[PDB]
């Protein structure tokens, strides 16, 4: 259910493969020069009560063609079902000095579909 | 300097590995019945102007003892200096029901540090 | 076009008026939580806004404590009002219940919610 | 407990009068340039167990003198006593175009004491 091609809203593609010991790996695409290395943990045996599957992943955002200095962690779960759905809230980290330390992270949300 | 192992204020500890090209691998600790598997991702290649270095890591709750059916994610960055220490915003959520999404996710922070 | 009665997408009712003085009052009824009937809400707003097409910076708290029940709780939403047509206020959200010191790591949930003048 | 004088580490300081009714009433300072208006609820009758007590309050960032088209939110507790602080969560959203709102909101986190 979760292996596979998922698309936000804003024209951004991720490919993950979701392994049986629990890890999560693959692409996210923001063009070479916007694809970054995905990682992550989920819930390899959730419930069967109609509950979501919980997971995480991080992109760090450097590649070999550019660096933001900051890092996005999405955390969320997985919808099966109807069309299959995974809701997150991500917080965005980016390198500051001490003094710009307190403006330094970005909170949002995203939902990615099969489609 | 990302290296090595660290805590938290409330006891935890989490052993990590910072990789050449921007891994992150370890465990997060609270005995083995409290060890589970993170991963995640860091800016392998940081300002020069005293920033810190954004990073971000993902634990979800299994392990081959116990499962919480949830996840945390750690966003935040590494601050080398005087003392070295990680400071995160974090999000957990939980496996809920659909009806039930809208109290999924708990969010706070951490400061971690190598003493 | 603050002022007025707006609902979110789990159908509870915000009926808010949008003062001169950057001030925001009104009532808040849950369709979800530990809650039944009105709730007092009070915030600020921008009351001079950027003419970029920037949107209207806003938030509000409500603490959950009536005359009929105390959540122990109270939650604030911080978010932009966007105007036009479809008029909208899109929300990230804080709910934090008192704790004591032990247990204040799961004192804070955190969601975004959505407001249109027409209920879903 | 609540009512009087409060700081944070960062300077900034806010002067509020809880009333007995849960309305939060009162200013927050960083000068009259930088003096605004605040406004919040807390739980007037919190429970008796050692919980501390539940609050929030906002300012929007525009008094006579400058506009930042932002408004501020934190989400907290009052715990009294001797060492009697204000631990928050918040959250501080930007006007924005729509093409921009994935980057409007801040979060972060605030402690204030009476010294």
Redesign the interface.
């Known amino acids: 259910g979760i292996t596979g091609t998922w698309y936000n809203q804003?024209g951004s593609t991720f490919i993950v493969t979701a392994g049986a010991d629990?890890?999560?790996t693959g692409t996210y695409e923001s063009n070479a020069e916007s694809r970054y290395?995905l990682?992550?943990?989920?819930?390899?045996?959730?419930?069967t009560?109609?509950?979501?599957?919980?997971?995480?992943?991080?992109?760090?955002?450097?590649n070999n063609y550019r660096?933001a200095?900051?890092?996005?962690?999405?955390?969320?779960?997985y919808?099966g079902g109807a069309e299959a759905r995974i809701?997150?809230?991500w917080?965005?980290?980016?390198?500051?000095?001490?003094a710009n330390?307190?403006?330094?992270?970005?909170?949002?949300?995203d939902t990615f579909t099969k489609v």
Chains 1, 2, 4 share one sequence.
């Open positions: 804003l629990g890890a999560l290395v990682t992550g943990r989920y819930d390899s045996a959730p419930a009560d109609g509950s979501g599957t919980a997971l995480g992943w991080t992109v760090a955002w450097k660096n200095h900051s890092a996005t962690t999405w955390s969320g779960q919808v809701n997150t809230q917080l965005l980290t980016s390198g500051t000095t001490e330390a307190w403006k330094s992270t970005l909170v949002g949300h």
